[PDB]
């Protein structure tokens, strides 16, 4: 039961990392 | 605990390992080089045993093509032969010790050739080298 | 206009318009790192117990076998194997491969190659962008530390089982056994590494606070100063002279850095040298050159022993030494 | 096998190293006579007696049929260089007794369900007798773990805690009384050997064996399973 | 040990190997005297 | 204060004093440093 | 000298001011070579003067003397020092030659020609002239090949070299039949670096060493002749950076690899680094400990073959993962060890039970005990034993010193190679002093996603 | 024996080749990549607007 | 013969020390190398002669 929670937490963290890398707010030169 | 009688273990050489690790004693005593020089009887017995073992066992192993066994025998008990020969020859006059050194060098070259042939796994060449080695060992033993 | 297949492939590989730079070092980096990542995740989730000491005493390290994140790890290769190469195709079956500790060796090898290629790719992009190529030299310190804990220590100790496990509690066990066997806390190189990390934290906080304290007013009080900075602007956003004046009145004038380039070089140089020395210390201790041994050093007139904090540390080491492997020893000396 | 004693002795250690040829028993040549042969009846000195298994089967407690298993501990399961005595009678009855040598090797195998089954492959104190067609006897199987072996929590028979040190509040731990006691008691097994060839010129014998014994019990904390081991064997009479 | 004829010169031998480190220090001293131009 | 230790200290002093002696001699006479 | 006013290099980077000064660079290199020879001679004299005959070489902290012992100088059968005069001769010769080398370096650095491209065209060069650099490389390759052949001649005609596997104990042999088989030479070179294989560190007889040195001498001479007569091809001109710093970085990487290899060879080898003069290796001490404990327990009336340990694997003898009979305990990881005192007891399928039950020799037992007690463990202040010992023994193995020092040197020279390769690649392109504000490369690229 | 295995670890083979198929794979892949590079290396050089003479390359 | 050999070795040591101290000084002065060449040449010759004499005399004291 707790193994599912551990795997869900790790998968969510990895998904957050992926989204942060590939869906970032692009820098714009003023 | 339960007592056991092992008082005869010391007579079997129980103190060899403990004496070899005694850092207070000199290196010659630890390695056994001091005892052999002091007592030449051990050197003579080792030389005779090495000669007999070389003859019989080398004949047997080369006959049956046992190369690993032959080489191990050549360096298992014969492992002190050079030091024993040097120690024996150092107690001779100048000319006698010079002749003994020449004969020992010739014999050692013969043993090197025999070991090379045993490593290369030849039968007739190893047999000839072994016969030559036996002749040279007999000559150097007679010289001493 | 490129026409050849190889010319087009080279232009694509060495392109600076990709979202993530590939390069020629990335060609080696991407597959090795992906292989190691896949094997690491799969083994961390569902791997069978691994016989680490070679005494037929398997140790569990997987989440599916009753573990949490803090307790889970990847058990190093079996002690029976030693330093022998143990690829997946040298096993009779995958069941035997997982029982002896194959995934650890696989991940370690692929990770080493991947980090070396990562440093190379850092240099490569620095060259392609028109920069100066020493950020890769900075990365060499963590690369060397990882190599020392994963490769050099097993190389000198004769077995991959003495390597650092890929876990948290495994890392703590590695540290404790390392202290019990080499007295790492008394090693000058470990002291230099500790000084390096402590000074790095000190100087990071010092620089951040000094820069944050000299921001020029460009906003109001209902918004953050980060909105006061504009990306790509040409003018400096803080008063280096004001920060230098504050620091030079805090300690004295000739202790602060009036040169921004010199200050940033010092910031780069301190932790890098510290980590270099600590990695060198680990690698040196791999070949059994331990730290200072001040045991029974203070002796009174009649010859009796007066104890010291070093002797208390020695008592702790003796405590954690006779228990680091209960059943793996048959003879009194741990010569390995 | 596929190699004789002379062929094996004709190699070098550097040539045998890593080829898994050291975990195998020699076979006889074309000069070997079938069965007992023409050996003069009498008591011989057994030497170079080795047994190379070729299959492991496990019957889990609660099953009436053996099951195949997959080995997990590589090439470490061959008993070799055992010495003893062999007596041959005029009728044909042979008696074999094993005194010394490497007569034990721990082995671990995995079964269909996924359970590792350690066992202690041994023919220690072998005592078999009968005709050359088949020799039936028995042997003693020592405990897989020694008396000084300590479990993960530091509990052992002759050394270690006698309770669970982690659970301090539970003063007596009457619920854990079963696992707090370790007993390294020994058991026995059964064997059924046979002789297929014999060379009276050099005093060499060979055949097949089938043995049955019990797996480990974690020092009396488990119900052992029954494991059947079959394979070939070789020995020299002199 | 050194031969009996070279015995009086033993103290000279005991201090030789530090000369390269002295050479590095001498390079630093020369740079200092030149005033780090 | 052993005689051997005194000789070693004398030799060390002579060797060390040979380094800055060159620098002092060249700086005092205005040499090409 | 020079100054930052006319060079742009600070005092801490002052050796970069003589990149384009051939005469001063040559003087610096000659002076450094003189320093190396001076250290060799002085250290040899220091070690020869502090040597006592009542202790073995590895017990007195010597690292240069065992190098001369392996060449067969002043040693006898069994590995006992007999004469100590050749060491003195070698040290004296090195120390005296260092004076000539240092004088040459000082002359060429102080008053010699500053740039020898106009007065000495044969010795002058330009870093960007590929032909001249290749010619110099060929000349030095010929010199190195001659050095390798000089080593080869010693083992054949000039008395030979110490062989630790010689029959009847180790002694100074003469190598008459070196192994020059292409399959044997290529087997060491293209071997795996992992356990069991060991790459070139696993060379186990002096015949292979002499054959490999014959090969390397011939290859170096042929390559030098090839480079003197040729110039780099198009595929080589298209791949390298041609400047002095680039050449320096290449050399730095090569010698970093060499340093790592030297560290591993010192730690693991037993043929070129006999245990009689360097002490036991890592695995050797563990094997010796197990051997001596087996011998002692056998003398007390025990069955070593059938003895069972606490884990049920075997106290003294067990089976390697491939089948060979090996020593039991934690020394099961060191079963690849092969030493002169242990080989005679080993059969085709591993250790022979009868041989170690009836044919163990006292000299073997003494060697095992000595290598057990002198294990390569110690502390920084030279205290022998494990980290939880007392102050009783002043000993650290010579293998440990060489291994640690040369690993440190190899790593630092790898870092130097990285630094110099990066700087050369940047400076040749032309942006080693920073980015150009007027023409910034990034401002001309399309923004990322 | 109970099962079968490659039995090649800790042997000392050249590049770890116990079967000629590994040699064939290595040689075929290397030759394919080399040929693809060899066809295009002439075009790649021409992108520098310079001829591959003795003065070619990145020099300082 | 031993006393002569020791005197030769001491003379060699003192000549070497004088050369070590003086050669950089002579070489590093303006227009000093071009004038005091004879002294340096004689010192080098004496150094070589002393080293050869010590090598020759070593054969009798050892
Ligand atoms: C062409 C490019 C390369 C292609 C191959 C690349 C493969 C990469 C795989 C991924 C993992 C990384 C590499 C792991 C290497 C492990 C080496 C090892 O287990 O052992 C090393 C071996 C030693 O081999 C030993 O050799 C021994 C020799 O045997 C014999 O040796 C003597 C022979 O007479 C004695 O008889 C002795 O008793 C006997 O055992 C034994 O066989 C041992 O079992 C065996 O392990 O050394 C050697 O191969 C010699 C030195 C090797 C190189 C240097 C190694 C150390 C430095 C690591 C890298 C740099 C780190 C610092 C920089 C970090 C930042 C970048
Ligand atoms: C820039 C540096 C900034 C920091 C400087 C700190 C102080 C350094 C100088 C003082 C060192 C010293 O007092 O040093 C003291 C010693 C000399 O003292 C003698 O040191 C001996 C060391 O043991 C040696 O000798 C013993 C007796 O024969 C045994 O044989 C033993 O096995 C052998 O190792 C004994 O302890 C003697 O009793 C003792 O008098 O200096 C020596 O030996 C020589 C010292 C120089 C060695 C240089 C090369 C080092 C190579 C190894 C590097 C390893 C990797 C790094 C590790 C960290
Ligand atoms: C490994 C040793 C080493 C060597 C051989 C050199 C070599 C060289 N250096 Mg470098 N250098 C070094 C280390 C070394 N350096 C270090 C550690 C630093 C950092 C402090 C520097 C920093 C540096 C700078 C800043 C400069 C040089 C320069 C020079 C060159 C010119 C010499 C000169 O003009 O002044 C020599 C000055 C003096 C007159 C002092 C003389 C003292 C003598 C040489 C001592 C040696 C004598 C010895 C005791 C006895 C030998 C005699 C024999 C008979 C036994 C010279 C080739 C110069 C250059 O770039 O040239 C263009 C220069 O600008 N160097
Ligand atoms: C093998 C020979 C070698 C050679 C010939 C060079 C040559 C050069 N180096 Mg490189 N380098 C090497 C190896 C080598 N390096 C190694 C192993 C490293 C370690 C990473 C470096 C790191 C390095 C740096 C960081 C720099 C150079 C630079 C330079 C140039 C100036 C050096 C200087 O003036 O010294 C002056 C000497 C000193 C100030 C003495 C410092 C003492 C050290 C820090 C420790 C004391 C030593 C102790 C025993 C440990 C010169 C072209 C400089 C540059 O300008 O490049 C163009 C520069 O910035 N080098
Ligand atoms: C054909 C003529 C020629 C010859 C014979 C040499 C020969 C030599 N050079 Mg090279 N050199 C040449 C041309 C030549 N060079 C040119 C034109 C240049 C450009 C100026 C250089 C630049 C150069 C430098 C900068 C250095 C050398 C060094 C050396 C020596 C290296 C060997 C050594 O380290 O011993 C160890 C290796 C051996 C294998 C043992 C010797 C075995 C014998 C030879 C057999 C060697 C004496 C190095 C040196 O040692 O200087 C004293 C040095 O630092 N050379
Ligand atoms: C001191 C060391 C040394 C150095 C630095 C160089 C340097 C160089 N060589 Mg020379 N060379 C040497 C010794 C050396 N060589 C020797 C001893 C030989 C005789 C074999 C040669 C024969 C030689 C040839 C035939 C060629 C060069 C070329 C070159 C240039 C290309 C760089 C390169 O290697 O590509 C980087 C390296 C590679 C891409 C891979 C090489 C690694 C090999 C394949 C490893 C396996 C070894 C090989 C099969 C040999 C057999 C092993 C042995 C046991 C027999 C460069 C200037 C080229 C050239 O420009 O000539 C003018 C060229 O075509 N060299
Ligand atoms: C030498 C030419 C180099 C050209 C340029 C190369 C640039 C870098 C490319 C990438 C290199 C890293 C990745 C390599 C992966 C493939 C190799 C691999 O995994 O092999 C792993 C295999 C393992 O082979 C194993 O062998 C066993 C029996 O021995 C069994 O058969 C196993 O099944 C089998 O896998 O090993 C080899 O192939 C041996 C490689 C030997 C290489 C010798 C090189 C000699 C010349 C260079 C000398 C210096 C080398 C560096 C030393 C110092 C290092 C600090
Ligand atoms: C360069 C050429 C030699 C390179 C290979 C050397 C390795 C030899 C291994 C053993 C000896 C073989 C005997 C043997 O044992 O056979 C079997 C051998 C397989 O390897 P092994 O493991 O058996 O090698 C033996 C050792 O590893 C242990 O003893 O096959 C080969 O070596 C093929 C090599 C030929 C391929 C090279 C062809 C080169 C010619 C190209 C055309 C030139 C034309 C010029 C015109 C002017
Ligand atoms: C264990 C997994 C179980 C199954 C999955 C469970 C639920 C997981 C989360 C599901 C929702 C994921 C994000 C939905 C919205 C995406 C919008 C988008 O990218 O483009 C539309 C959106 C459309 O706008 P347009 O392109 O201007 O038309 O594009 C954008 O760029 C919008 C800006 C926001 C971008 C994303 C902001 C952060 C989202 C959450 C990040 C963390 C996710 C953690 C979970 C990852 C997966 C495990
Ligand atoms: C340029 C330069 C530099 C460098 C320099 C150098 C590096 C030099 C070297 C030099 C050298 C490297 C020198 C050497 C010398 C040597 C000598 C001078 C020797 C002597 C010897 C003797 C005298 C001996 C004796 C004896 C005998 C015979 C026997 C036994 C005893 C005895 C030991 C006593 C520097 C850094 C400052 C910086 C600036 C520039
Ligand atoms: C003496 C001896 C021997 C022999 C040895 C030999 C014969 C060796 C050889 C060796 C060799 C023969 C080596 C080689 C090496 C090589 C290398 C190490 C290479 C490298 C390369 C590189 C690094 C490259 C790079 C690159 C690329 C890849 C791309 C483009 C760019 C460039 C070109 C840069 C033996 C062991 C038998 C025994 C002992 C003794
Ligand atoms: O495995 Mn991990 O830790 Ca390297 O020491 Mn010996 O073995 Mn075990 O004990 Mn201590
Ligand atoms: Cl053990
Ligand atoms: Fe900043």
TrEMBL record, chain B:
Residue stretches in coiled coil: 33-60
Name of the featured protein: Chloroplast oxygen-evolving enhancer protein 3
Molecular function GO terms recorded: calcium ion binding
Compartments it resides in: Plastid, Chloroplast thylakoid membrane
A GO-annotated cellular component: extrinsic component of membrane
Part of the intact protein present: 59 to 202 of 203
BP GO terms, sorted: photosynthetic electron transport chain
Major localization class: plastid
Family from the record: Belongs to the PsbQ family.
Entry keywords, A to Z: Chloroplast, Coiled coil, Membrane, Photosynthesis, Photosystem II, Plastid, Thylakoid, Transit peptide
From TrEMBL, chain F:
Pfam families noted in UniProt: PSII_Ycf12
Annotated TM spans: 6-26
UniProt feature coiled coil, ranges: none
Location within or outside the cell: Membrane; Plastid, Chloroplast thylakoid membrane
One GO BP: photosynthesis
Protein topology in the membrane: Single-pass membrane protein
Gene Ontology CC: chloroplast thylakoid membrane; photosystem II
Keyword set, alphabetical order: Chloroplast, Membrane, Photosynthesis, Photosystem II, Plastid, Thylakoid, Transmembrane, Transmembrane helix
Family named by the database record: Belongs to the Psb30/Ycf12 family.
Subunit (UniProt): PSII is composed of 1 copy each of membrane proteins PsbA, PsbB, PsbC, PsbD, PsbE, PsbF, PsbH, PsbI, PsbJ, PsbK, PsbL, PsbM, PsbT, PsbX, PsbY, PsbZ, Psb30/Ycf12, peripheral proteins of the oxygen-evolving complex and a large number of cofactors. It forms dimeric complexes.
Name of this chain's protein: Photosystem II reaction center protein Psb30
Upper classification of the organism: Eukaryota, Viridiplantae, Chlorophyta, core chlorophytes, Trebouxiophyceae
UniProtKB/TrEMBL annotation, chain G:
Binding site for chlorophyll a 4: 29, 251
Main location: membrane
Key words of the record: Acetylation, Chlorophyll, Chloroplast, Chromophore, Manganese, Membrane, Metal-binding, Phosphoprotein, Photosynthesis, Photosystem II, Plastid, Thylakoid, Transmembrane, Transmembrane helix
Residues that bind chlorophyll a 1: 2, 15, 17
Bilayer-spanning residue ranges: 25-46, 58-75, 87-110, 133-153, 210-229, 250-268
Pfam family, one: PSII
Residues the entry annotates as binding chlorophyll a 10: 417, 425
UniProt binding sites for chlorophyll a 2: 15, 419-420
KW Chloroplast (keyword) present: yes
Sites where the protein binds [CaMn4O5] cluster: 343
Binding-site positions, chlorophyll a 8: 213
Assigned GO CC terms: chloroplast thylakoid membrane; photosystem II
Protein family: Belongs to the PsbB/PsbC family. PsbC subfamily.
General function of this protein: One of the components of the core complex of photosystem II (PSII). It binds chlorophyll and helps catalyze the primary light-induced photochemical processes of PSII. PSII is a light-driven water:plastoquinone oxidoreductase, using light energy to abstract electrons from H(2)O, generating O(2) and a proton gradient subsequently used for ATP formation.
Subunit structure: PSII is composed of 1 copy each of membrane proteins PsbA, PsbB, PsbC, PsbD, PsbE, PsbF, PsbH, PsbI, PsbJ, PsbK, PsbL, PsbM, PsbT, PsbX, PsbY, PsbZ, Ycf12, at least 3 peripheral proteins of the oxygen-evolving complex and a large number of cofactors. It forms dimeric complexes.
Record-given protein name: Photosystem II CP43 reaction center protein
Phylogenetic placement of the source organism: Eukaryota, Viridiplantae, Chlorophyta, core chlorophytes, Trebouxiophyceae
TrEMBL record, chain H:
Lineage top rank: taxon: Eukaryota
Locations listed in the record: Plastid, Chloroplast thylakoid membrane
Bilayer-spanning residue ranges: 22-40
Signal peptide (UniProt feature, chain positions): none
Family of the protein in this entry: Belongs to the eIF-2-alpha family. Belongs to the psbW family.
Protein name: PSII 6.1 kDa protein
Biological source species: Chlorella ohadii
Lineage: Eukaryota, Viridiplantae, Chlorophyta, core chlorophytes, Trebouxiophyceae
Parent-protein residues present: 388 to 447 of 447
């Amino acid at each position: 039961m707790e193994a599912l929670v551990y795997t869900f937490l790790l998968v969510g963290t990895l998904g957050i990392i992926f989204f942060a890398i590939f869906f970032r707010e692009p820098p714009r030169i003023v | 605990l339960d007592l056991f009688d092992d008082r005869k273990a010391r007579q079997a050489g129980f103190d060899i390992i403990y004496e070899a690790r005694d850092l207070d004693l000199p290196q010659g005593v630890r390695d056994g080089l001091a005892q052999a020089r002091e007592n030449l009887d051990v050197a003579k017995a080792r030389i005779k045993e090495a000669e007999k073992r070389i003859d019989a066992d080398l004949d047997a192993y080369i006959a049956k093509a046992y190369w690993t066994e032959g080489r191990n025998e050549l360096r298992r008990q014969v492992g002190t032969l050079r030091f024993d020969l040097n120690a024996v020859a150092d107690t001779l006059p100048k000319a006698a010790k010079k002749e003994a050194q020449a004969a020992k060098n010739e014999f050692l070259a013969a043993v090197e050739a025999l070991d090379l042939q045993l490593r290369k796994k030849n039968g007739d060449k190893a047999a000839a080298a072994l016969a030559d080695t036996k002749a040279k060992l007999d000559a150097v033993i007679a010289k001493l | 206009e490129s026409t050849s297949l190889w010319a087009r492939f080279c232009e694509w590989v060495t392109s600076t318009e990709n979202r993530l730079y590939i390069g020629w070092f990335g060609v080696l980096m991407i597959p090795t790192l992906l292989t190691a990542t896949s094997v690491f995740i799969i083994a961390f989730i569902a791997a069978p117990p691994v016989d680490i000491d070679g005494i037929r005493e398997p140790v569990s390290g997987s989440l599916l076998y009753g573990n949490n994140i803090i307790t889970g790890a990847i058990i190093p290769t079996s002690n029976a194997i030693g330093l022998h190469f143990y690829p997946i195709w040298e096993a009779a079956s995958l069941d035997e491969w997982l029982y002896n500790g194959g995934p650890y060796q696989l991940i370690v090898c692929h990770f080493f190659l991947g980090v070396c290629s990562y440093m190379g790719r850092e240099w490569e992009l620095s060259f392609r962008l028109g920069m100066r190529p020493w950020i890769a030299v900075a990365y060499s310190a963590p690369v060397a530390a990882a190599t020392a804990v994963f490769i050099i220590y097993p190389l000198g100790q004769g077995s991959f089982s003495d390597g650092m496990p890929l876990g948290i509690s495994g890392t703590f066990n590695f540290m404790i056994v390392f202290q019990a066997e080499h007295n790492i806390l008394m090693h000058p190189f470990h002291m230099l590494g500790v000084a390096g990390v402590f000074g790095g934290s000190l100087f990071s906080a010092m620089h951040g606070s000094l820069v944050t304290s000299s921001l020029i007013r460009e906003t109001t009080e209902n918004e953050s100063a980060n909105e006061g900075y504009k990306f790509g602007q040409e003018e400096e956003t803080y008063n280096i002279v004001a920060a230098h004046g504050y620091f030079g009145r805090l300690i004295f004038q000739y202790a602060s850095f009036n040169n921004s380039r010199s200050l940033h070089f010092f910031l780069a140089a301190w932790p890098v040298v510290g980590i270099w020395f600590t990695a060198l210390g680990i690698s040196t201790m791999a070949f059994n050159l331990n730290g200072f041994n001040f045991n029974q050093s203070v002796v009174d007139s009649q010859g009796r022993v007066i104890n010291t904090w070093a002797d208390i540390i020695n008592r702790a080491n003796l405590g954690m030494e006779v228990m680091h492997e209960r059943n793996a020893h048959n003879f009194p000396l741990d010569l390995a | 096998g596929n190699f004789t004693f002379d062929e094996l002795q004709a190699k070098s250690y550097l040539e045998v190293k890593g080829s898994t040829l050291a975990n195998q028993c020699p076979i006889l040549g074309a000069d070997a006579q079938q069965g007992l042969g023409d050996v003069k009846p009498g008591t011989f000195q057994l030497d170079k007696f080795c047994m190379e298994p070729s299959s492991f089967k496990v019957k889990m407690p609660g099953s009436k049929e053996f099951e195949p298993s997959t080995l997990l501990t590589r090439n470490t399961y061959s008993l070799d260089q055992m010495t003893g005595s062999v007596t041959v009678k005029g009728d044909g009855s042979v008696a074999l007794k094993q005194q010394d040598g490497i007569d034990f090797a721990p082995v671990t195998v995995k079964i269909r369900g996924g359970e590792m089954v350690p066992f202690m492959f041994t023919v220690k104190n072998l005592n078999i007798e009968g005709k050359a067609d088949g020799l039936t006897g028995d042997f003693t199987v020592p405990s897989y773990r020694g008396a000084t072996f300590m479990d993960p929590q530091g509990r052992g028979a002759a050394s270690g805690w006698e309770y669970v040190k982690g659970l301090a509040a539970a003063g007596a731990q009457e619920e854990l009384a079963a696992e707090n006691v370790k007993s390294a008691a020994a058991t026995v097994g059964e064997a059924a050997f046979a002789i297929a060839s014999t060379d009276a010129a050099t005093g060499e014998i060979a055949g097949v064996f089938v043995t049955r014994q019990l797996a480990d019990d974690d020092l009396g904390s488990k119900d052992p399973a029954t494991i059947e081991i079959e394979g070939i064997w070789y020995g020299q009479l002199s | 040990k050194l031969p009996e004829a070279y015995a009086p010169f033993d103290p000279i031998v005991d201090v030789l190997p530090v000369i390269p480190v002295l050479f590095l220090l001498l390079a630093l001293v020369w740079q200092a005297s030149v005033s780090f131009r | 204060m052993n005689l051997e230790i005194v000789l070693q200290l004398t030799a060390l002093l002579f060797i060390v004093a040979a380094g800055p002696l060159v620098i002092v001699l060249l700086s005092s006479r205005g040499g090409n440093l | 000298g020079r100054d930052q006013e006319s060079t742009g290099f600070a005092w801490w980077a002052g050796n970069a001011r003589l990149i384009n000064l051939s005469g001063k660079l040559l003087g610096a290199h000659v002076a450094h070579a003189g320093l190396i020879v001076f250290w060799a001679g002085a250290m040899n004299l220091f070690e020869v003067a502090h040597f006592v005959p009542e202790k073995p070489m590895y017990e007195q902290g010597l690292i240069l003397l065992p190098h001369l012992a392996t060449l067969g100088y002043g040693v006898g059968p069994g590995g006992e020092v007999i004469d100590t005069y050749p060491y003195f001769v070698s040290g004296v010769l090195h120390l005296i030659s260092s004076a000539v080398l240092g004088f040459g370096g000082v002359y060429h650095s102080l008053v010699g020609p500053e740039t020898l491209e106009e007065s000495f065209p044969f010795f002058g060069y330009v870093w960007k002239d590929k032909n001249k650099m290749t010619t110099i490389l060929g000349i030095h390759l010929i010199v190195l090949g001659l050095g390798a052949w000089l080593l080869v001649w010693k083992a054949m005609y000039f008395g030979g070299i110490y062989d630790t596997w010689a029959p009847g104990g180790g002694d100074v042999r003469i190598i008459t039949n070196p192994t020059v088989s292409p399959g044997v030479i290529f087997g060491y070179l293209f071997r795996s670096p992992f356990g069991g294989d060991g790459w070139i560190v696993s060379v186990d007889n002096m015949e292979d060493v002499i054959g490999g040195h014959i090969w390397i001498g011939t290859l170096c001479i042929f390559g030098g002749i090839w480079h003197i007569l040729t110039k780099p091809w198009a595929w080589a001109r298209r791949a390298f950076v041609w400047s002095g710093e680039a050449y320096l970085s290449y050399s730095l990487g090569a010698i970093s690899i060499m340093g790592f290899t030297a560290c591993c060879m010192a730690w693991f080898n037993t043929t070129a680094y006999p245990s009689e003069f360097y002490g036991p290796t890592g695995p050797e001490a563990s094997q010796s400990q197990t051997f001596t404990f087996l011998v002692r327990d056998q003398r007390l009336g025990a069955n070593v073959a059938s003895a069972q340990g606490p884990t049920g694997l075997g106290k003294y003898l067990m089976r390697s993962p491939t089948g060979e009979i090996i020593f039991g305990g934690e020394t099961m990881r060191f079963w690849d060890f092969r030493g002169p005192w242990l080989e005679p007891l080993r059969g085709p399928n591993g250790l022979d039970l009868n041989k170690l039950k009836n044919d163990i020799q006292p000299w073997q037992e003494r060697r095992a005990a000595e290598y057990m007690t002198h294990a390569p463990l110690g502390s920084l202040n030279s205290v022998g034993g494990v980290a939880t010992e007392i102050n009783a023994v002043n000993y650290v193995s010579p293998r440990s010193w060489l291994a640690t020092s040369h690993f440190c040197l190899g790593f630092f020279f790898f870092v130097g190679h990285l630094w110099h390769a990066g700087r050369a690649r940047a400076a040749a392109a032309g942006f080693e002093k920073g980015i150009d504000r007027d023409n910034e490369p990034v401002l001309s690229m399309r923004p990322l996603d | 024996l109970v099962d079968d295995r490659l039995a090649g670890e800790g042997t000392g083979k050249i590049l770890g080749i116990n079967d000629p198929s590994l040699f064939w794979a290595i040689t075929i892949v290397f030759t394919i990549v080399w040929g693809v590079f060899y066809v295009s290396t002439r075009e790649i050089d021409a992108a520098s607007d310079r001829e591959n003479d003795d003065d070619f390359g990145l020099t300082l | 013969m031993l006393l002569i050999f020791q005197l030769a070795l001491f003379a060699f040591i003192v000549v070497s020390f004088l050369l070590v101290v003086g050669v950089p000084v002579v070489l590093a002065t303006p227009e000093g190398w071009a004038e005091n060449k004879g002294t340096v040449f004689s010192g080098i010759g004496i150094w070589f002669l002393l080293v050869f004499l010590v090598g020759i005399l070593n054969s009798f004291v050892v």
